[PDB]
């Protein structure tokens, strides 16, 4: 879904009676360059690959 | 001691200003960039309140950073750096003075 729904994202599946607010508790930048590489391989270079394979082969 | 250094510095500075008509333009910009920061802090000291603290910090950052880029242009514009002309210090002043206004409009 969108990038606007990620900067302010309240998930209720962790610390259950009182869920955590993610956007003020994590460091973005490892996720958004990865969504950028996914968006560039899928639309411009022509080859669609899964998000799991972009996440595994992100360090080498 | 301090009388001699005082009158020496006044005369040796005012002759330097009256030589080049670029320097009094920089310093005339600089002094009123000091008065903006002074009365903008006087509003905070006058009524004891601290509520939109980022909107306080953004204008003050504009005053200080905009002062500093002028002093760097002045230092680089009188004496030339080895390798840098006078057409490139000005373009670097435009670009780096143009990033700072955007990141101090996002912040308020």
């Amino acid at each position: 879904n969108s990038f606007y729904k990620f900067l302010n994202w309240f998930d209720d599946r962790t610390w259950y009676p009182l869920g955590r607010v993610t956007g003020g508790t994590l460091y973005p930048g490892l996720m958004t360059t990865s969504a950028f590489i996914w968006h560039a391989l899928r639309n411009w270079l022509g080859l669609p690959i899964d998000i799991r394979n972009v996440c595994v082969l992100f360090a080498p | 001691d301090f009388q001699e250094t005082f009158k020496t510095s006044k005369r040796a500075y005012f002759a330097q200003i009256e030589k080049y008509p670029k320097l009094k333009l920089i310093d005339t910009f600089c002094f009123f960039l000091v008065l903006l920061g002074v009365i903008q802090c006087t509003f905070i000291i006058l009524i004891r309140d601290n509520f939109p603290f980022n909107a306080f910090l953004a204008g003050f950052i504009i005053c200080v950073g905009q002062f500093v880029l002028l002093m760097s242009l002045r230092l680089q514009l009188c004496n030339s750096f080895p390798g840098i002309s006078k057409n490139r210090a000005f373009a670097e002043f435009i670009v780096a003075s143009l990033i700072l206004h955007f990141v101090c409009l996002h912040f308020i």
């Binding site: - | 008509p21 009094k24 333009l25 005339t28 910009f29 903006l36 009365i39 009524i47």
Partner: protein, 57 residues
């Protein structure tokens, strides 16, 4: 253990205090004085002497 139980409510927090608007009009008036003092002081002295106008091609 099975009667009626007393109804309750919640207690919010007070909002942060705003300052009265007949001061901020005075200070934006003072800023509007100082900037025009800057433009008048540039056009007064030799600084804004428009003399290398790049007309031509």
């Amino acid at each position: 253990k099975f009667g009626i139980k007393p109804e309750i409510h919640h207690i919010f927090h007070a909002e942060p205090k705003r300052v009265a608007k007949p001061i901020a009009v005075i200070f934006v008036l003072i800023i509007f004085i100082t900037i025009l003092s800057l433009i008048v002081t540039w056009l007064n002295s030799c600084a804004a002497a428009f003399n290398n106008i790049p007309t031509g091609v």
